[PDB]
Amino acid sequence: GKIRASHILVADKKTAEEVEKKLKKGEKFEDLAKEYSTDSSASKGGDLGWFAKEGQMDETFSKAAFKLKTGEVSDPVKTQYGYHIIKKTEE
Numbered sequence: 001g002k003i004r005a006s007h008i009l010v011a012d013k014k015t016a017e018e019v020e021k022k023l024k025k026g027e028k029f030e031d032l033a034k035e036y037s038t039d040s041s042a043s044k045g046g047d048l049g050w051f052a053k054e055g056q057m058d059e060t061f062s063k064a065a066f067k068l069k070t071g072e073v074s075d076p077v078k079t080q081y082g083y084h085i086i087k088k089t090e091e
Contacts (some may be wrong), residue, residue: 004090006046007057008032009039009082012043016076016083029073029087038082047089060088 006029012026019036020042023029033046041048051057053066058079068074077084 002052003066003088004050005048005068005086005088006030006033007039007041007048007061007087008037008046008085009041010036010085011038011082013076013078016085020076021044023073024091040070044091046087051088 002023008016008019008029010019015036022032033042037046040073048057051062053060053062053063055062057065058081060077060079061084062082064074065086065088068086070088072088072090074086077086
């Protein structure tokens with residue numbers, strides 16, 4: 001099957017550690033994507049549309065996205081592109 005989620009991607013973990021604090025401070029994940037993400041998804045509030053566990057974004061990212069439940073947010077994930085952060089939005 002498939003799921004839908006939103007993400008934030010950064011060049012190194014030091015930017016992701018600030019986003020983890022910002023998420024507890026009160027700012028929404030969908031607006032932090034417009035302020036901290038470096039992927040083209042930033043202007044969409046981090047959204048990626050529907051995808052599968054097989055590795056459509058990255059083989060490490062997809063496993064973390066599928067562990068979640070709709071509404072839940074994830075701790076940082078290393079890939080070949082940088083450090084990602086994920087939040088599931090539909091299933």
